[PDB]
């Protein structure tokens, strides 16, 4: 998946369905909520840079050179932490999309065919009831199991 | 045949944040930690007169 949806206004991670009833962008509140919770906590841990280091009490030149050099060292180190955890949150986002995709594959099994990136073509027909079943985590393989097999026999021949 | 797709959010945000592998990448939502805007140019009281 290398496509960002501008239509998702609800959530960071979601679904795009095209059935007989209609076509819609629909977020998954659970995934994006847990993402926001985890990144909030990450940000708080990041802010835990201990830069309080201070001493209440040729020497003055030495204290001068020391304080200044340590300042530059720690600014470099802080920008490093920022770079690191920027990549880490972006990778976290990637993994969340992956997990959503696995949640959908698990339920669909062979009742669907992975068109590409993150798309599934059902061999059966899905209402928004049968769509929000998958989203709700309540899609049942047997309900349509043979119904799909039949249409597979139209791709077989 | 009916299809269902999975994807992620994308919004008109010019926020740029620096990863390790790549610098200056457009991110949907960022949070700033630096404050230069309040230079002040005035020496007010700090909890009491100076």
């Amino acid at each position: 998946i290398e496509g960002g949806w501008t239509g998702m206004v609800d959530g960071w991670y979601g679904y795009h369905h095209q059935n007989e009833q209609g076509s819609g962008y629909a977020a998954d509140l659970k995934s994006t909520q847990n993402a926001i919770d985890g990144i909030t906590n990450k940000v708080n841990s990041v802010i835990e840079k201990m830069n309080t280091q201070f001493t209440a009490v040729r020497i003055e030149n030495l204290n001068k050179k020391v304080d200044d050099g340590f300042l530059d060292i720690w600014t470099y180190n802080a920008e490093l932490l920022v770079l690191l955890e920027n990549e880490r949150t972006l990778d976290y986002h990637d993994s969340n999309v992956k997990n959503l995709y696995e949640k959908v594959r698990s339920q669909l099994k062979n009742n669907a065919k992975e068109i590409g990136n993150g798309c599934f073509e059902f061999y059966h027909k899905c209402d928004n009831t049968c769509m929000e079943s998958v989203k709700n985590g309540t899609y049942d393989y047997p309900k349509y199991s043979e119904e799909a097999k039949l249409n597979r026999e139209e791709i077989d021949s | 045949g009916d299809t269902l797709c999975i994807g992620y959010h994308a919004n008109n945000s010019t926020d740029t944040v620096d990863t390790v592998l790549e610098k200056n990448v457009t991110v949907t939502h960022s949070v700033n930690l630096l404050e230069d805007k309040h230079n002040g140019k005035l020496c007010d009281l700090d909890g009491v007169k100076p």
Partner: peptide, 27 residues
């Protein structure tokens, strides 16, 4: 770098943004 009271820690850099969202990559 010289501050008094509850002040943000002084830093010698220009930008320090943390990514909190997705890579924005439209269409």
């Amino acid at each position: 770098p010289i501050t008094i009271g509850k002040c943000p820690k002084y830093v010698k850099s220009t930008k320090l943004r943390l990514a909190t969202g997705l890579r924005n990559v439209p269409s």
